[PDB]
Design a protein around this ligand. Structure first.
Ligand SMILES: *[C@@H]1O[C@H](CO)[C@@H](O)[C@H](O)[C@H]1NC(C)=O
Ligand SMILES: *[C@@H]1O[C@H](CO)[C@@H](O)[C@H](O)[C@H]1NC(C)=O
Ligand SMILES: *[C@@H]1O[C@H](CO)[C@@H](O)[C@H](O)[C@H]1NC(C)=O
Ligand SMILES: *[C@@H]1O[C@H](CO)[C@@H](O)[C@H](O)[C@H]1NC(C)=O
Ligand SMILES: *[C@@H]1O[C@H](CO)[C@@H](O)[C@H](O)[C@H]1NC(C)=O
Ligand SMILES: *[C@@H]1O[C@H](CO)[C@@H](O)[C@H](O)[C@H]1NC(C)=O
Ligand SMILES: [Sm+3]
Ligand SMILES: [Sm+3]
Ligand SMILES: [Sm+3]
Ligand SMILES: [Sm+3]
Ligand SMILES: [Sm+3]
Ligand SMILES: [Sm+3]
Lengths: 639, 639
């Protein structure tokens, strides 16, 4: 069949699927407080597993894992205002929720208020946090980062609250759940999978806080500010009530007693074997666990995952759809702790997944509103996101998703808190991640209020919306399979690479003071450009009939993304090796970020570090080229 | 054509080729002291380059490189006996040769004599080297290692001489050339290629001595012993004359002044495009540089390389030979310093070469005698070495190379000093390396005596011998290409892996004292066995006509070797990642080697180190499995 056919079919199928029901079903007490590794968790897990079986799809299995999660100890965690001795006022509060992987300790001192988790940026404010507890708003960044920065400035203890402006929740006595791990997955099995506790049981600090972090209710925040002299700025796009520093007269004490708890995570798979490249998959995932009932955090996703798997299987058996490449749906678990489920899976194919999975879609938090349509992905999926937003019509507005007034659409970078991030920054798999987002992030998100009710009370046509999300997700799959040519934008990296070279040339001056020639970089950038130009040519000259010549090409395409992961850094040390989207000194952005410091004439600039950064970052790109063809044995022997 | 045809043809072609002439030609003053990066060097380089062109073979190019080599400074290096002052005795000797990368310094003190470069083993002798110069024989190990151990025991300065028993050279006034780098290639570009000196110019110590090392003439050795009280043991399979320690009355002073010198290495290639898998090569290399005239060290090799390239091209054009996979001959340079030429080439395709080269043959030191026939290679080429030694008849003896009295032949491990080692231990390419060796290693090897004369004076039928070597080398190539199925023994690794498990079970006791379950390892070993069993099956069921299904299989085979390189260690830190043949704590052998120390009840055993060693070494094997198939998504979801 042809695209129109698949597009049309997939639509009517989407026209007759109740997503709202399943989003509700995944709310019955049968599986409501489906915490990570809980019974409910395991309940829904088997539900999905069976549903897949019922869907009559091909092979479907389970993925067991034992990771260390952190939970609230029997001893109560609390915040209390107290002078250089005893609590005068009252125990601010005994927080109802907590920040996982938080340093298990208790300390007291001054209490500064660095708007939006310091943002790392905001830390450049007047009052110093040099040895004092800090308050921050839940927002622009992730707790992990908020805390990380706080501690990088030598602070201790961090409180996170949901202000009124950012979080318009009527109830101010509401508490939410946190993360705190500056990474992805179990924080003791970096790059390699985990085992028992009995075996390989290190404690922590392997990329974990080392500073107590506690989530606080707005109400509690109110009271804290009540005992603070300083006055909150207008710079902070907030609203009155907060201070900046506690009234000297007295300080505050934070006490968090949390304990590690080995649980058994259960990932559930299920594929749909392809017909020509049966061994090249399109991983479609969806977080299944959640702290509260997580109708949004986990409902909509799993809801889509199921309904979406139900369709393709059907299409394959009844409608004649013959996906040239297999599809593999996966419902991860222990996701509230950093995609621990999906990550440790990847951890499992540390150097082969890219040979198998060529793209990872992600349905998490797919429906959160009806205004915007945020989209984050690897440039390799740029044109797919585009052309698809040109085929899918907004659920509310009768118009298409794509803003016809531009030629350059907006695509966001994947964040440390998105299961898709690991797939791309660690496993080198290109990944997309859409969201029918809103200017303001869903409030009830990390709290017990993520109910199917308060959701649909806030998004009336949730069905139509989820449908759309299920449609863009569907087309991605049809598209990434329908045709024999693996359609990934390996060109977009030329641009991505040129942009770097450009930004780097703004320091040609600094580059000159240092003996650096910066010539080898251009060569790489070019040696790579050709590589793509050949591939982009060889394709055109090859016939969509020679299963062999095509397979040889598609494989080259399939290498592109993975090969941009620094082959000079160990996964065990720095898991996000992707020079473009990773995190670490190997990061391309990180290079400029160090060089910028050169001008500051201070010591902030580590020259030896740069020298290497450039040196390697060059050979990384270079290699990416020699790997992406050049007909092998690239013959630019001159230079 | 069929094997017999190719075998028969290749033979008569070998029957009519004067190898002796070319081994001589490569001795004319036109290119005699062809040191690394010298003019002569560059001369022969262009000779080979043109010869290849003349051979009318397909593409042929050059490979430029700027590595830092070490050379003898204008200031003379010398050894002189002297007391706590007053430099008594005659100027023992101003050594004619030198040990590259040796620490540039000068020191004096006691002089111990640790037979055969300490061997690391021999260091367990009576007299301590704790702060004193040391003497060693050139033998069992490499200078690099000899020195390394010496310094690990806190010694300073090391002299290397060629004793009479081991080196039956009439002339005792003869001096030889050394190495000293405990690695492979330029010692400042570990894992990543080099640049200019102007750019990235670190000094050294990046895996280099830090202790002066000087080669000494037997004559000089004589004199040293002359001023020594101790008496040489019979344990040392040597002969009279040497002592153990200098006569207390006085000591010796070593002064080495060498300087680094950026040179331009020139690797010369030339391929023979295949007909079905044109992009899967069989790298056939041969060191081209040398200190002395190196007729053996470099002549015979380059001699074969040329003559061997001359044949296949001819066979392809005239005889109808249609290699299903391309052949690529390569004459490296700067090889006397650690395969610096070939290594930095590999350094170039840090993560893709295995996707290109599926086997590396090596002609270096192919002819050195006529008695034995040593052979070193990766178990993946075991059956080829075997079946071939069953087809090639010894040049002297009319009988076949293969000892018919066994079913299990002897194959040696690749050493740090073999261009093939890097290909296998660093790039993950299976590599063979034969030698018509002798019980005693060629004496003139590292000295100005490696002449075509003294050679043929010591091996009369050098032509027939070289011919044989050129024949086993030839069949390897014909065999690795003739057929459509990539013939590599990926099975032999099951054995190789089981042997490990076995040897490891001898410590099940220790493994038990520690909470270790050691169960995950068996699973991997097994999860891998199945993998090979499927591949070994899929092949049988596939037809040598479906270029597609075969390509998909051969590729899997082509992954086998590379995937045993610890994906948890950085090439920049530990370049030889191969868990089996590499070097480092990631090494499989290294694991046992640490565990053995457990019993010693002392602290020598690092438990935390083991814990990881096992942990990762497990996932390494595991991964090797998940990468070698299991039909993708290995479904041993239970466990
Ligand atoms: C850091 O903060 C402490 C108070 O905790 C203060 O005494 C000190 O002056 C600040 N700066 C330094 C360098 O210690
Ligand atoms: C992992 O630990 C759990 C509980 O400690 C146990 O049930 C399970 O059998 C262990 N798995 C292995 C492979 O030892
Ligand atoms: C500078 O970077 C090099 C290499 O990354 C490192 O060895 C050194 O400790 C760093 N120095 C500082 C001040 O960061
Ligand atoms: C090491 O050698 C020195 C002589 O250089 C000697 O004085 C000392 O006793 C030896 N052992 C130690 C532990 O220093
Ligand atoms: C490398 O250095 C040599 C001599 O310093 C010079 O001839 C050559 O052009 C340099 N190469 C580059 C790329 O700068
Ligand atoms: C033991 O090994 C661990 C990890 O390899 C290392 O951190 C530690 O320093 C080692 N200790 C000793 C005494 O070797
Ligand atoms: Sm982990
Ligand atoms: Sm309401
Ligand atoms: Sm180039
Ligand atoms: Sm190097
Ligand atoms: Sm003679
Ligand atoms: Sm298994």
């Amino acid at each position: 069949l042809y695209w129109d056919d698949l597009k049309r079919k997939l639509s009517e199928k989407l026209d007759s699927t109740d997503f709202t029901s399943t989003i509700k079903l995944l709310n019955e007490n049968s599986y409501v407080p489906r915490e990570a590794g809980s019974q409910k968790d395991e309940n829904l897990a088997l539900y999905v597993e069976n549903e897949f079986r019922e869907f009559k799809l091909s092979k479907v299995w389970r993925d067991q894992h034992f990771v260390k999660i952190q939970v609230k100890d029997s001893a109560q965690n609390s915040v209390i205002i107290v002078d250089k001795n005893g609590r005068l006022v009252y125990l601010v509060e005994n927080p109802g929720g907590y920040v996982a992987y938080s340093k298990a300790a208790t300390v007291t001192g001054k209490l500064v208020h660095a708007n939006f988790g310091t943002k790392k940026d905001f830390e450049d404010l007047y009052t110093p946090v040099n040895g004092s507890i800090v308050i921050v708003r839940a927002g622009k960044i992730t707790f992990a980062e908020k805390v990380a920065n706080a501690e990088s400035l030598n602070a201790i203890g961090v409180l996170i609250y949901m202000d009124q402006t950012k979080f318009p929740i009527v109830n101010a006595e509401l508490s939410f759940f946190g993360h705190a791990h500056l990474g992805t997955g179990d924080p003791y099995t970096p790059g390699f999978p985990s085992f028992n506790h009995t075996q390989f049981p290190p404690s922590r600090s392997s990329g974990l806080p080392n500073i107590p972090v506690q989530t606080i209710s707005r109400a509690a925040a109110e009271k804290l500010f009540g005992n603070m002299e300083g006055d909150c700025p207008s710079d902070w796009k907030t609203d009155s009530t907060c201070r900046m520093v506690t009234s000297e007269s007295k300080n505050v004490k934070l006490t968090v007693s949390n304990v590690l708890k080995e649980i058994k995570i259960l990932n559930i798979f299920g594929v749909i074997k392809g017909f020509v490249e049966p061994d090249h998959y399109v991983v479609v995932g969806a977080q299944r666990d959640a702290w509260g009932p997580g109708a949004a955090k986990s409902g909509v996703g799993t809801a889509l995952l199921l309904k979406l798997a139900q369709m393709f299987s059907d299409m394959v058996l009844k409608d004649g759809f013959q996906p040239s490449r297999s599809i593999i749906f996966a419902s991860w678990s222990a996701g509230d702790f950093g995609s621990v489920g999906a990550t440790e899976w990847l951890e499992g194919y540390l150097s082969s997944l890219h040979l198998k999975a060529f793209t990872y879609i992600n349905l998490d938090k797919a429906v959160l509103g009806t205004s915007n349509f945020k989209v984050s992905a690897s440039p390799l999926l740029y044109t797919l996101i585009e052309k698809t937003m040109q085929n899918v019509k907004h659920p509310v507005t009768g118009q298409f998703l794509y803003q016809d007034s531009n030629w350059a659409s907006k695509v966001e970078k994947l964040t440390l808190d998105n299961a898709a991030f690991p797939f791309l920054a660690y496993s080198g798999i290109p990944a997309v991640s859409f969201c029918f987002c809103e200017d303001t992030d869903y409030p009830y998100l990390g709290t017990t209020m993520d109910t199917y009710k308060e959701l649909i009370e806030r998004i009336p046509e949730l069905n139509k919306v989820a449908r759309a999300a299920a449609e863009v997700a569907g087309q991605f799959v049809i598209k990434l399979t329908h045709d024999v040519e693996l359609n990934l934008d390996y060109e977009e990296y030329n641009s991505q690479l040129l942009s770097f070279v450009r930004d780097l040339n703004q320091y040609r001056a600094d580059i000159k003071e240092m003996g650096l020639s910066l010539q080898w970089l251009y060569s790489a950038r070019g040696d790579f450009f050709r590589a793509t130009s050949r591939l982009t040519t060889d394709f055109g000259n090859a016939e969509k009939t020679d299963r062999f010549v095509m397979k040889k090409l598609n494989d080259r395409v399939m290498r592109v993304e993975y090969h941009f992961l620094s082959p000079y850094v160990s996964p065990k040390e720095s898991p996000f090796r992707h020079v473009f989207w990773g995190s670490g000194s190997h990061t391309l952005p990180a290079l400029l970020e160090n060089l910028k410091l050169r001008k500051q004439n201070n010591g902030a600039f580590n020259e030896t570090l740069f020298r290497n950064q450039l040196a390697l970052a060059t050979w990384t790109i270079q290699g990416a080229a020699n790997a992406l063809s050049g007909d092998v044995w690239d013959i630019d022997n001159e230079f």
